[model samples]
Target: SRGALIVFEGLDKSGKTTQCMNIMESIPANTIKYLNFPQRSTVTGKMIDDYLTRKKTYNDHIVNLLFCANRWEFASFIQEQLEQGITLIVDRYAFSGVAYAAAKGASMTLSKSYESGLPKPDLVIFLESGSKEINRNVGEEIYEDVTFQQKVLQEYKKMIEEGDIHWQIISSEFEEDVKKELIKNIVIEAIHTVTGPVGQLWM
Candidate 1:
């Protein structure tokens, strides 16, 4: 009677959005609604975009809360959709909010903060940019440091190791079509297995 909330996250340049859209086309329309974090329409989300684009600044703590608010603002709507039996496929979710802040030295504070404020994602797909981490040139934006990004990935993997979250790791080193196909099957199979009531994050 409820829908699944699936999220995909990875390095900015990685193929998460590409794969999500592909998965969108692969699945039945209207059955799955695609949403991306920092929706950019809300006041909190606008601040988030400003901070991301370097047009504004804030303490890591404040900015991280903005990101959390951006997601939480949609909390009821997300729950409503799930109750309506429409799966939600998102590009990024709470994981990025936590990882980005923790990467910047805020640590797991951001991670634990959103646990009770938002509905937990049913599934999360994390993409790794090949065995050798690749990064775009500097001046990309805030949190562009390669070292910081590595810390972000580490934080993500740490969550996986903790075994409380449903996270899946996929490598982007494979051929384009092959990578899409593989992840598509993975997503489909995961969605197929969803059942019962939605669970709380960080439980």
Candidate 2:
């Protein structure tokens, strides 16, 4: 048996972290293990943190490659955990790295580069919200403005439309009750589709 990989993705301050915590709490603690990217405590993560927080700047190509490097450094650990049947709840995954880097107007195309060697998520939950709402909450990141965020959102929507991956879209503007109900149904569907105990990626 192996564990499931569940990923939550959205712009910063879109309540993704909060929603991720809520989802974990709603599930059996023993069944899920939470992990977030830019695992900022690590040396490699320190680099990512520095870049994201604007502590340093590099060539767009270099910065994007570092982001991918950060993921590559931890790929083996993630694979090992999933093989051991430990469900992983990721706060943000390669999608963020791809989308954000691409949104930054980098002509080198970060999305394609970062996604190349990554293990795709078993379930990708996108917390979709309006740019206005995102702007209100997200203070001062590089791509925090309404215009840039909207572009990112458009990219996500295009991905959904293309149907290249498994993704569930959740509107963040809904009332609590509605949001809960929607999430509940999504969880049920995921469990149903991935039945027969836990599973890992690639194996």
Best by lDDT: 1
Global CA lDDT of candidate 1, please? Answer: 0.80
Candidate 1: tens digits of C-alpha lDDT, residues 103-152: 77876954676645577787888888754445562657777767677788
Q: For candidate 2, write residues 21-134 as lDDT tens digits.
A: 777777887777888886877777887778777888878778777777777787787777777777777887777776777677654244665556566677888887765567
Off by over 4 Å in 1: 131-133
Quick one: best TM-score, which candidate? 1
Q: What clash pairs does model 1 have?
A: none
Alpha carbon lDDT at 83, candidate 2: 72
Off by over 4 Å in 2: 107-110, 195-203
